[PDB]
Amino acid sequence: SLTFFDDYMNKSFLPKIQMTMDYLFTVEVESNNPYALELSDENHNIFKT
Amino acid sequence: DINLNKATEFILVDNNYNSTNEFWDGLMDRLSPYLSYFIDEKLKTEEDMI
């Protein structure tokens, strides 16, 4: 049962990259439809930046 | 002393919450002040009604 490199770099580390990205998007949800600071504009929201 | 906001600990809306407050207290107490100025228009006589 040779490789095993990848097999987790195939299965585990790639799906962990996908869901790690997803939770990383859940660290930018911030519950605001909208609000921001925006030197030029409104820019709606902190979501955007 | 509602809108003294280092804003915002709500943050809802980004300085638009008190608009809803004096909005709604405008609304409910409006129809009460209506009759209170209508019934109570006779009890709002041509004296200090001004």
Quick one: resolution in A?
Answer: 4.4
Interface-testing mutation among B8, B9, B14, B17, with chain A (most A C-beta atoms within 10 A): B14
Cα separation, A23 vs A25, in Å, equals 5
What's CA B42's distance to the chain center, in Å?
Answer: 23
Residues of A in contact with B13 (CB under 8 A): 35
Residue with tokens 């609304």: B27
Which residue type is seen at A15?
P
Question: In chain B, what residues touch A35 (CB-CB under 8 Å)?
Answer: 11, 13-14
Phi, psi of B40 (to 5 degrees): 65, 0
Q: Which residues of A touch B14 (CB under 8 A)?
A: 32, 34-35
Using CA atoms, how far apart are residues B9 and A19, in angstroms rounded to an integer? 31
Residue A38's nearest CA partner among A28, A30, A26, A47 is: A47
